[PDB]
Amino acid sequence: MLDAFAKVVAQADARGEFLTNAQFDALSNLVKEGNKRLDAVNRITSNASTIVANAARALFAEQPQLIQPGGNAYTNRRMAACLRDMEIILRYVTYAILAGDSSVLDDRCLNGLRETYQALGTPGSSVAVAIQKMKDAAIAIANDPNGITPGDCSALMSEIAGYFDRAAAAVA
Amino acid sequence: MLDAFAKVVAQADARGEFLTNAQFDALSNLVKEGNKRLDAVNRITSNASTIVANAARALFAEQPQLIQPGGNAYTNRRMAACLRDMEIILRYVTYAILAGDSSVLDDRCLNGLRETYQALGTPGSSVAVAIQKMKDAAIAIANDPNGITPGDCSALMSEIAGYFDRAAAAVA
Amino acid sequence: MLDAFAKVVAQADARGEFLTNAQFDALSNLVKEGNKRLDAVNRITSNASTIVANAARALFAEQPQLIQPGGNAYTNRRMAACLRDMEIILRYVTYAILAGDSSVLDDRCLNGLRETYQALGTPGSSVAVAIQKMKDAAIAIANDPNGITPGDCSALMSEIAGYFDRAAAAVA
Amino acid sequence: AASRLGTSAFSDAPPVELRANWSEEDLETVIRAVYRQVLGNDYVMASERLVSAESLLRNGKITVREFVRAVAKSELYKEKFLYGNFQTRVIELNYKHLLGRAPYDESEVIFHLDLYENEGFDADIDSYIDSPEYTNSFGDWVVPYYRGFNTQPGQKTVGFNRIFRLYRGYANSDRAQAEGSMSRLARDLATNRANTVVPPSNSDTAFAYYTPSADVPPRACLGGSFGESGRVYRIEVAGIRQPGYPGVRRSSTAFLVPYEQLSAKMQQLQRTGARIISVNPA
Amino acid sequence: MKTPITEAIAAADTQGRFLSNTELQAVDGRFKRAVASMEAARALTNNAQSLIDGAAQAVYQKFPYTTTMQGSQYASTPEGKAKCARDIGYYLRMVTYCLVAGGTGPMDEYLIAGLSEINSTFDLSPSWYIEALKYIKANHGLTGQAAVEANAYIDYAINALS
Amino acid sequence: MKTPITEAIAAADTQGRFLSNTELQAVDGRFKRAVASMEAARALTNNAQSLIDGAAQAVYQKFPYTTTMQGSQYASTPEGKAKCARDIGYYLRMVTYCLVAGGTGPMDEYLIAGLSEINSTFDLSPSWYIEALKYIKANHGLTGQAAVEANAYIDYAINALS
Amino acid sequence: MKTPITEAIAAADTQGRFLSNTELQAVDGRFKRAVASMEAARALTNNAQSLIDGAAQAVYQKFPYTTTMQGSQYASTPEGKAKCARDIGYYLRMVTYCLVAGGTGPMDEYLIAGLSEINSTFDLSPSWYIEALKYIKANHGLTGQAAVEANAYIDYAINALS
Amino acid sequence: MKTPITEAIAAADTQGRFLSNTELQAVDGRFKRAVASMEAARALTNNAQSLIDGAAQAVYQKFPYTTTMQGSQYASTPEGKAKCARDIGYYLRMVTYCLVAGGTGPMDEYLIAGLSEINSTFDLSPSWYIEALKYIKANHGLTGQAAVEANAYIDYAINALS
Numbered sequence A, B, C: 001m002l003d004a005f006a007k008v009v010a011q012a013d014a015r016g017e018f019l020t021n022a023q024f025d026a027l028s029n030l031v032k033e034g035n036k037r038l039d040a041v042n043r044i045t046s047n048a049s050t051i052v053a054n055a056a057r058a059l060f061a062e063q064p065q066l067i068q069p070g071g072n073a074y075t076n077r078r079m080a081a082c083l084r085d086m087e088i089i090l091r092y093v094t095y096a097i098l099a100g101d102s103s104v105l106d107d108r109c110l111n112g113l114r115e116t117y118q119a120l121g122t123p124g125s126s127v128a129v130a131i132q133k134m135k136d137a138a139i140a141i142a143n144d145p146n147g148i149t150p151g152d153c154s155a156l157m158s159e160i161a162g163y164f165d166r167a168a169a170a171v172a
Numbered sequence D: 001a002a003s004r005l006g007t008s009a010f011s012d013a014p015p016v017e018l019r020a021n022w023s024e025e026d027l028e029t030v031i032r033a034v035y036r037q038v039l040g041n042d043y044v045m046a047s048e049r050l051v052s053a054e055s056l057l058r059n060g061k062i063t064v065r066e067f068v069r070a071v072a073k074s075e076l077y078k079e080k081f082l083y084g085n086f087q088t089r090v091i092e093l094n095y096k097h098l099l100g101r102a103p104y105d106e107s108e109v110i111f112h113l114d115l116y117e118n119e120g121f122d123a124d125i126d127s128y129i130d131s132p133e134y135t136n137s138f139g140d141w142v143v144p145y146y147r148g149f150n151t152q153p154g155q156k157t158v159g160f161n162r163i164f165r166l167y168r169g170y171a172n173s174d175r176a177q178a179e180g181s182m183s184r185l186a187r188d189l190a191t192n193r194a195n196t197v198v199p200p201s202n203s204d205t206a207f208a209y210y211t212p213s214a215d216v217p218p219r220a221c222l223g224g225s226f227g228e229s230g231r232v233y234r235i236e237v238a239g240i241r242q243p244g245y246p247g248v249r250r251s252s253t254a255f256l257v258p259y260e261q262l263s264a265k266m267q268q269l270q271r272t273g274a275r276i277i278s279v280n281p282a
Numbered sequence E, F, G, H: 001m002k003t004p005i006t007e008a009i010a011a012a013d014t015q016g017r018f019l020s021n022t023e024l025q026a027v028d029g030r031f032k033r034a035v036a037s038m039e040a041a042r043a044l045t046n047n048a049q050s051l052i053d054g055a056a057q058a059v060y061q062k063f064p065y066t067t068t069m070q071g072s073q074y075a076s077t078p079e080g081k082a083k084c085a086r087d088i089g090y091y092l093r094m095v096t097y098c099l100v101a102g103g104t105g106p107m108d109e110y111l112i113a114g115l116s117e118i119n120s121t122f123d124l125s126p127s128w129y130i131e132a133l134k135y136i137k138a139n140h141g142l143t144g145q146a147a148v149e150a151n152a153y154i155d156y157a158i159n160a161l162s
């Protein structure tokens, strides 16, 4: 696992060159906007439960086949599993946001995740739709401009969207 | 672990003599009233959760020091532990009732429970009080005369009272 | 493991109520002197290896019977174990200094050490002497007035002495 | 009640299964933790570590279960425990190191001992490793931990007592303990006898209270005792040293005392210096 | 012992669950069969002397060599005859115990456990006991379901010997 | 408890290494946040009565059935009203403990651990406490980053109840 | 699932031995009781609609607040009434399944597994289903041992919710 | 690596919980210290060549025998002097990686692991590199808390080699 700082230093170690001035200033820029990153992750994690719950209700309303008898989100045990996996994806994406890199998202998630869903027979496309619902919810809550110091964090929001997109593409 | 029939067989095997006629008839008497035994265990096990919950409310009303802060049944995880270790005693007593002997109750539940509680600090008097609270509720629920073909059950009720009492004395 | 803040919280939880103004002031005093605490722990950790090595040489010069044939610091395996144990005591004392509370020092490291040495046969008094050598060395290293912004630090140095003393007394 | 009992913090589970099963750092931690649990917190020197097993461990060819078995059957483990102790004592140590518990009843010793007598020691370790308990509580990717403290699995109450006989502190190692070189839970296991919990030492005087019932009063009073109002409290003590007339005799012992006299007796005991282990109603 | 009631209790205990209706139904079946079981046990024990002495003579007839050949394993001496009688009595006693317990428990704990080892060390050829078991199966003097259950347990023993 | 300081100590202990710059940086961050954290804690503990009494009335308004329906789980009886006051006070006390501790440790060990079992056995629906916590999160009367810290811990409780 | 036949099979499989007479007796008892069990199942399914509707009204009467309070987890909307008619139907269906299976297997696999999680995520209260199950147990209209078995499964669900 | 950010992430991951304020506080401390850390890294890298050559001469002076005795593990040959320069350059490059990463991760994973094995097989006594690192720690020419942290990392390496 390599966060953003760790990632840049690891590639620089592979090349075997002292960190160059450009890399130094890139890292300084990362630190300068670090407070924003922390604020965004705090706000997302504070509403984690509501995000997952609302997204789940929406998914089962839009795709009733899942909760109909014989569907993969039936039997109340598989329903618990589905909620668990949605919140797991949210948890690892929040880890990724705090890190600044996608290394954690790919290691301990999405790696041999497509295959597991494919073998279980659970539709991966529906999983992607669920991830997208959570993406909209999280980006809205993470860009809410009320209750906080003013600023512009659109870059960080696009980064969050990128992480969610990566996951949804890997599972579907 | 010795059930009634096994107990008779074991004590006959130690002496090395074929089962005597007296022992035969004793076991036959146990079989004759076996349906009563099964009815009693069925009733108690059917209402286990309510039995434990009601007795717990009573215990904390009669001994408020448990709920009061700094005690042993405070902080909501120790509350969970207290409920767990009341229902555990109920479970092993039901095992005993079905068996017809106290062997299982004294071998796998009450065999040193006193010392464990001593080490933890859990007040040993209060657990006995809790078992008694459960005792009256369970005996009443098993002796409920409505819902089944009427008959005699006083002997069996005394027997289960004996099991509860044995545990309550051994834990104090 | 309890740190200073956690210690105050745990006492307050035992008594219920709500954090008193006095307790607030105590914690504020802890934080206003926190930079000192961190500096001290950094200095001790940076010279850990030399502290242990120098104290070991002194111990074996002062009490040669330990390293003479047939003594408990003989055969090059027990010598390795002795060096290990000295370093471990230093490590858990360093933990205690950073925490501000001696709970960690007595909860893992000193928890059972006495009987361990009693069974091994290792002279506990000699171990105490070694800990005291380390005490003087580390306190001198931390109290070195050159190399950092000057200021009052005597209270923290006395606290470091207190931790080392607790360990040395518990082993002997 | 954590510090006195000895369970400082055993409050999580260290798996190694990951996309980064090595995880570049976490594997170091897992290897250390396996060494601490399997070898009984023995101080393994660097030269004698089982390098061959760790090779396969990072490679992923072997799981944590295979790593634990490799250590358990390697001569590193055998020299410390297997060869040097009574066989029943070895069974106890296996239960402590591999399944994180203590023998719940005599049948456990019967079964494991018979395996050792016929099949060999390797098969005995095999039985512990692949027993349903190891397969469930741990998962071929989870280092064994002392789950005996927690009661969730389903166990005889005595188990709690018994595990505290084997674990005599965070610092302690089973190669080096007060009662070592002889069976610690053998006489009790045949009689299904409970054991008073001996707290490990913690920055105060320690007096390991052996409890051979060969010469002690019974757990119960078995009578009316003095007959004074109130029941009979059994008081234990270990370090009686001041009044040695022939030599005190039976320095560690218990006395059944009627309630009214307890206070007086207490001070007498404190005068000798023995720290009362327990005061249990009889 | 591994008695039906205790086996159900242990199965529930390993999962920490109250006794559900499955186990209760099982024990009910045990009680329903217990009437015939007790009848058969009483019949076997009241006629035990005939079934022990006759079985001894039956093995003496099927194996003449066991009552003549010199050696401790044989019953040529009167002391050996006493040993033979005691062992046949053990088998009959165990069958009665198993019948009363309603399950294989007693038989496995007090007989079958290590039976091969003991018969292979003290030179006690299992064929002797299996013939004796056959005799007691034939003169069991039991009818109806009482007969069938008893003979089943006897058959268990013979299959365990071989 | 899961206190930042203790978490760093445990991270160093599981690897066996002396406290590195990573752990020191972490605890320094905690000390730097502690000024605002202690301000927030003072605010909650000095205004406790308003917050708790108002929360009690808020839950009575949100769920009117809870102050009418007969039954021990409800606060229709005066004894139940006392219970409600005591428990809301416990929640606020734990949040103040967490604020001063600098982490979520105290509420993990003295609130959340086994909260599901209790809330199910005594029929105490978590939604009641969720709404009460919402009231406290709105009336705490904090500002700046102190408000952020207090709201973070309150929302931890809210999500744990859910 | 935990069907009597299959658990006997698993018990023999763990030991690695062919099915002994004890297991065969157990499954014979199962087959003997199956006639009554299936008659009771037919009776329960023939009046299923009336039972489900009556239970839905019973919970509406015990908890009027649930039919007025606005929100997703309430039956104040026609969609919520549909959800009630769905879930109560599921519980009755599972009871019939348990009756046919002669064990709690179906109940565990299709209902109890993760029930605790779901009732917290979707803000459902277990008490609702408990009251509905009580209505079902009182109006099942079965008699005899079959009635006993059905009530046992219903109470299993009741205690699982609690 | 053991980077403070990822250490907090791992601490939350092993307990399967969303990032609490504990981990957020830790990362905040890292960002606060990062200003000085990056200043220190820039300082060390900008004069890296000067410090490398100075350290090489320092080791040559402290251990003259290393420049004279014949053997593969000596710098008597120009190729040996080149390898010595390469090694001390590796140490300085790794310390400047560790400064930017924010913890002792880089030093631990890319060095300090099996260092004992290598130093024992090729017979490079650690004392040489220890003295070289001491020279670097005395001539780094930093000031303030930046100097403090750079020294701390260098001394971590020194104690690891010992």
Ligand SMILES: CCC1=C(C)/C(=C/C2=NC(=C\c3[nH]c(/C=C4\NC(=O)[C@H](C)[C@H]4CC)c(C)c3CCC(=O)O)/C(CCC(=O)O)=C2C)NC1=O
Pocket (backbone or CB within 6 Å): A032, A033, A035, A036, A038, A039, A040, A042, A142, A143, A144, A145, A148, A149, A150, A151, A152, A153, F145, F148, H021, H024, H025, H028
């Ligand atoms: C414990 C972890 C942690 C958190 C959560 C945290 C919050 C935090 N946010 C801050 C600033 C800030 N936070 C924002 C955040 C935003 N601006 C926007 O327009 C958005 C809608 C939103 C981001 C999505 C901005 C713009 C600042 C001030 C400028 C800056 O720091 O970059 C600051 C610095 C000044 C201050 O407010 O005191 C802190 C300390 N600090 C922490 O140490």
Ligand SMILES: CCC1=C(C)/C(=C/C2=NC(=C\c3[nH]c(/C=C4\NC(=O)[C@H](C)[C@H]4CC)c(C)c3CCC(=O)O)/C(CCC(=O)O)=C2C)NC1=O
Pocket (backbone or CB within 6 Å): B066, B071, B072, B073, B074, B078, B079, B081, B082, B083, B085, B086, B088, B108, B109, B113, B116, B120, B122, B123, B126, B127, B130, D001, D002, D149, D150, D151, D152, D154, D155, D156, D157, D160
């Ligand atoms: C199957 C047989 C069995 C029994 C009997 C049993 C008892 C038992 N109860 C325990 C804990 C406990 N038990 C209680 C119970 C109580 N608190 C109170 O206020 C009351 C007086 C009392 C209930 C009436 C508490 C509070 C603890 C936790 C103590 C602690 O962590 O400090 C523990 C310690 C380990 C654990 O937490 O599970 C055991 C072993 N465990 C078993 O497996």
Ligand SMILES: CCC1=C(C)/C(=C/C2=NC(=C\c3[nH]c(/C=C4\NC(=O)[C@H](C)[C@H]4CC)c(C)c3CCC(=O)O)/C(CCC(=O)O)=C2C)NC1=O
Pocket (backbone or CB within 6 Å): B033, B034, B035, B036, B038, B039, B040, B042, B043, B142, B143, B144, B145, B146, B148, B149, B150, B151, B152, B153, E021, E024, E025, E028, G145, G148
């Ligand atoms: C699934 C396991 C199982 C159960 C539950 C079961 C119940 C059962 N209880 C019965 C009767 C009875 N039930 C009782 C019970 C009582 N008498 C009292 O005064 C008390 C209030 C109460 C104690 C619970 C009595 C006395 C009889 C008649 C005699 C008997 O069979 O026990 C009968 C026989 C007559 C009848 O059909 O009513 C059965 C079959 N049978 C079973 O195989």
Ligand SMILES: CCC1=C(C)/C(=C/C2=NC(=C\c3[nH]c(/C=C4\NC(=O)[C@H](C)[C@H]4CC)c(C)c3CCC(=O)O)/C(CCC(=O)O)=C2C)NC1=O
Pocket (backbone or CB within 6 Å): C035, C036, C038, C039, C040, C042, C142, C143, C144, C145, C146, C148, C149, C150, C151, C152, C153, F021, F024, F025, F028, H033, H144, H145
């Ligand atoms: C990586 C996390 C981290 C650490 C470790 C840290 C330490 C730290 N402690 C400090 C303060 C201090 N440093 C001392 C040091 C001393 N004065 C003396 O006379 C003694 C010889 C000695 C005691 C060992 C004192 C007294 C202060 C307090 C005054 C202040 O805060 O500036 C300072 C500011 C001035 C200085 O460098 O001393 C820093 C940077 N800051 C951090 O962010």
Ligand SMILES: CCC1=C(C)/C(=C/C2=NC(=C\c3[nH]c(/C=C4\NC(=O)[C@H](C)[C@H]4CC)c(C)c3CCC(=O)O)/C(CCC(=O)O)=C2C)NC1=O
Pocket (backbone or CB within 6 Å): D052, D054, D055, D056, D057, D058, D059
């Ligand atoms: C059956 C006995 C046995 C063998 C053979 C074995 C091989 C083996 N060598 C390994 C590593 C390695 N082996 C090498 C070896 C080499 N690097 C080079 O430049 C050379 C060309 C070559 C030596 C001549 C390297 C570099 C690694 C490290 C891979 C890594 O961690 O990135 C690994 C990876 C996991 C680990 O390091 O434990 C395995 C499994 N393991 C075993 O238990």
Ligand SMILES: CCC1=C(C)/C(=C/C2=NC(=C\c3[nH]c(/C=C4\NC(=O)[C@H](C)[C@H]4CC)c(C)c3CCC(=O)O)/C(CCC(=O)O)=C2C)NC1=O
Pocket (backbone or CB within 6 Å): D086, D087, D088, D106, D109, D110, D111, D113
């Ligand atoms: C160091 C190796 C070692 C020894 C020696 C040992 C002894 C030992 N012998 C046992 C049994 C036994 N040992 C005997 C021994 C004898 N009975 C007699 O009549 C004779 C006088 C004598 C043989 C000549 C008996 C009868 C039992 C069974 C006791 C019982 O089940 O109650 C048991 C009980 C548990 C079991 O049966 O599995 C142990 C622990 N255990 C060991 O690990």
Ligand SMILES: CCC1=C(C)/C(=C/C2=NC(=C\c3[nH]c(/C=C4\NC(=O)[C@H](C)[C@H]4CC)c(C)c3CCC(=O)O)/C(CCC(=O)O)=C2C)NC1=O
Pocket (backbone or CB within 6 Å): C066, C072, C073, C077, C078, C079, C081, C082, C083, C085, C086, C088, C089, C108, C109, C113, C116, C120, C122, C123, C126, C127, C130, D041, D042, D043, D044, D170, D171, D172, D173, D175, D176
């Ligand atoms: C993390 C807390 C902790 C501590 C402290 C601890 C102590 C500890 N020290 C040990 C050994 C030892 N301890 C010493 C200690 C000394 N000998 C001397 O001459 C000196 C006076 C002294 C050093 C100052 C020695 C020589 C051994 C090895 C004995 C042996 O294995 O034979 C052992 C067991 C034997 C072994 O090393 O395998 C333990 C368990 N264990 C722990 O888990």
Ligand SMILES: CCC1=C(C)/C(=C/C2=NC(=C\c3[nH]c(/C=C4\NC(=O)[C@H](C)[C@H]4CC)c(C)c3CCC(=O)O)/C(CCC(=O)O)=C2C)NC1=O
Pocket (backbone or CB within 6 Å): D240, D241, D242, D243, D244, D245, D246, D247, D248, D249, D250, D251
């Ligand atoms: C008649 C049978 C009998 C025995 C066996 C006996 C043993 C015995 N020896 C004692 C003392 C002692 N025994 C020793 C013995 C030793 N010290 C050492 O350094 C050596 C390792 C070891 C001899 C080789 C010591 C030092 C004490 C005093 C302990 C103390 O005051 O702390 C004590 C403590 C009370 C006292 O001193 O009176 C007892 C009970 N007493 C008896 O009445």
Ligand SMILES: CCC1=C(C)/C(=C/C2=NC(=C\c3[nH]c(/C=C4\NC(=O)[C@H](C)[C@H]4CC)c(C)c3CCC(=O)O)/C(CCC(=O)O)=C2C)NC1=O
Pocket (backbone or CB within 6 Å): E059, E066, E067, E072, E073, E074, E075, E076, E080, E081, E083, E084, E085, E087, E088, E090, E110, E111, E118, E122, E124, E128, E129, E132
């Ligand atoms: C309760 C379960 C149980 C069984 C089954 C059992 C068998 C048993 N039979 C034995 C001996 C014996 N058993 C016999 C039996 C026979 N001789 C014959 O001619 C017949 C064919 C046969 C009877 C059918 C004889 C003669 C001995 C003595 C053999 C000897 O001393 O070498 C012995 C040797 C110890 C002794 O001398 O008694 C055992 C252990 N012991 C048991 O505790």
Ligand SMILES: CCC1=C(C)/C(=C/C2=NC(=C\c3[nH]c(/C=C4\NC(=O)[C@H](C)[C@H]4CC)c(C)c3CCC(=O)O)/C(CCC(=O)O)=C2C)NC1=O
Pocket (backbone or CB within 6 Å): B057, B060, B067, B073, B074, B075, B076, B079, F056, F059, F066, F067, F072, F073, F074, F075, F076, F080, F081, F083, F084, F085, F087, F088, F090, F091, F110, F111, F118, F122, F124, F128, F129, F132
């Ligand atoms: C320190 C951590 C901690 C918590 C959180 C805790 C909760 C807790 N609340 C309880 C009861 C209760 N809680 C309430 C609370 C309420 N009643 C209402 O009407 C409202 C809607 C609501 C307040 C908003 C009531 C009425 C009871 C008593 C229920 C009964 O007697 O059955 C009980 C049962 C024991 C008792 O009677 O007190 C526990 C264990 N206990 C703890 O130790």
Ligand SMILES: CCC1=C(C)/C(=C/C2=NC(=C\c3[nH]c(/C=C4\NC(=O)[C@H](C)[C@H]4CC)c(C)c3CCC(=O)O)/C(CCC(=O)O)=C2C)NC1=O
Pocket (backbone or CB within 6 Å): A057, A060, A067, A074, A075, A076, A079, G056, G059, G066, G067, G072, G073, G074, G075, G076, G079, G080, G081, G083, G084, G085, G087, G088, G090, G110, G111, G118, G122, G124, G128, G129, G132
């Ligand atoms: C096959 C087994 C099975 C069960 C048990 C089950 C329960 C279950 N009930 C649900 C919802 C629900 N359950 C109810 C039920 C009720 N509303 C009330 O007012 C009453 C008091 C109560 C009925 C008597 C309602 C209204 C919802 C919708 C809540 C929502 O969409 O947020 C949901 C969420 C998905 C949905 O909207 O359907 C599940 C998963 N699902 C299952 O697959």
Ligand SMILES: CCC1=C(C)/C(=C/C2=NC(=C\c3[nH]c(/C=C4\NC(=O)[C@H](C)[C@H]4CC)c(C)c3CCC(=O)O)/C(CCC(=O)O)=C2C)NC1=O
Pocket (backbone or CB within 6 Å): H059, H066, H067, H071, H072, H073, H074, H075, H076, H080, H081, H083, H084, H085, H087, H088, H090, H110, H111, H118, H122, H124, H128, H129, H132
């Ligand atoms: C990034 C981590 C890393 C380190 C630390 C490292 C060190 C390292 N230095 C080596 C050699 C060497 N290094 C030196 C260096 C020196 N000559 C002197 O006079 C001085 C005292 C000293 C410099 C301070 C010499 C002489 C050898 C050759 C030894 C031989 O071939 O026998 C070798 C053996 C293989 C080789 O020739 O490269 C290693 C592995 N390599 C690494 O990848």
